[PDB]
């Protein structure tokens, strides 16, 4: 599953709903802190819809637990990331992933 360690608190009133577009900045890393993806490096906030499987299950689940403005570290185990396969070239098999996620807006 997903564990969340808060970095900055959110507002505690605005949580993502099912189907809702959330806008985040994120950095996706392997368990050693090696970055494999970052919206920050693109200078473009990333949008996806909660519960529509547009991102890995753990990312979606983690963001659903966050309130607007919150920044959190998500620890995501392989069964809710890329599993035993992994992502060839990108994510090794059975990889635990760490995402630094900031919830910037809900649409």
Numbering used by the authors: 1 to 107
Quote the study's own text.
A survey of crystallization conditions for the cysteine-free variant of FKBP12.6 yielded two distinct crystal forms, one belonging to space group P21, yielding a data set at 1.70 Å resolution, and one belonging to space group P3121, yielding a data set at 1.90 Å resolution. The two non-equivalent monomers in the asymmetric unit of the P3121 crystal form differ from each other by only 0.35 Å r.m.s.d. for all of the backbone heavy atoms. In contrast, both of these unligated FKBP12.6 monomers differ from the rapamycin-inhibited FKBP12.6 by an appreciably larger backbone r.m.s.d. of 0.81 Å. These larger differences primarily arise from the transition between a type I and a type II turn for residues Gln31–Lys34 in the unligated and rapamycin-bound crystals, respectively. As illustrated by the P3121 crystal form of the unligated protein, the interactions surrounding residue 76 are largely similar to those for the rapamycin-inhibited wild-type FKBP12.6, with the maximum backbone perturbation occurring at Val80 Cα, which is displaced by less than 0.7 Å owing to steric inter­action with Cγ2 of the substituted isoleucine side chain. Despite the close alignment of the backbone heavy atoms for the two non-equivalent monomers in the asymmetric unit of the P3121 crystal form (0.35 Å r.m.s.d.), the orientation of the aromatic ring of Phe59 at the base of the active-site cleft is strikingly different. In molecule B the phenylalanine ring superimposes upon that seen in the rapamycin-inhibited FKBP12.6, which in turn is closely similar to the orientation of the Trp59 ring in the numerous X-ray structures of the wild-type FKBP12 protein. In one monomer from the P3121 crystal form, the aromatic ring of Phe59 at the base of the active site is rotated perpendicular to its typical orientation, generating a steric conflict for the immunosuppressant-binding mode. The reoriented aromatic ring of Phe59 in the presently reported structure of FKBP12.6 likewise partially occludes the active-site binding pocket.
